Design a protein around this ligand. Structure first.
Ligand SMILES: *[C@@H]1O[C@H](CO)[C@@H](O[C@@H]2O[C@H](CO)[C@@H](O)[C@H](O)[C@H]2NC(C)=O)[C@H](O)[C@H]1NC(C)=O
Ligand SMILES: *[C@@H]1O[C@H](CO)[C@@H](O)[C@H](O)[C@H]1NC(C)=O
Lengths: 48, 48
């Protein structure tokens, strides 16, 4: 080569995504106390 | 998540002033044959 080109190029890399949290009783049962009572057998799964 | 407990109770039914014809359909003098069974429309009444 007898010449050169100074090249600037971009590289887009994801780093983080959206941090999310889930309230199980509001999703599964909403505001009903009967479903909230029945959901007490599934608390370990929601903690997981 | 932040829960708000209900305090009052709201009941909203359409305003009906008539009882349902229980005596007309249960204490009728004659009943239809099963092959020619009678159908009666029931509307605008309170099913006590
Ligand atoms: C169904 O209809 C019959 C016939 O109308 C009613 O029997 C009458 O009942 C009254 C009130 O007890 C008596 O005074 C009469 O003697 C009965 N017989 C007749 C021929 O009128 C019966 O009570 C009715 N049942 C209902 C729930 O309304
Ligand atoms: C190299 O290229 C540049 C343009 O990119 C030009 O101005 C320069 O004269 C060249 N150099 C050489 C041919 O030696």
């Amino acid at each position: 080569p007898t010449n050169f080109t100074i090249s600037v190029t971009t590289e887009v890399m994801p780093v983080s995504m959206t941090k999310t949290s889930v309230d199980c009783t509001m999703y599964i049962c909403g505001d009903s106390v009967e479903c909230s009572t029945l959901l007490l057998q599934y608390g370990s799964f929601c903690t997981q | 998540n932040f829960r708000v407990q209900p305090q009052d109770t709201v009941v909203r039914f359409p305003n009906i002033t008539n009882l349902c014809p229980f005596s007309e359909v249960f204490n009728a003098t004659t009943f239809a044959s099963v092959y020619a069974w009678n159908r009666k429309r029931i509307s605008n009444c309170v099913a006590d």
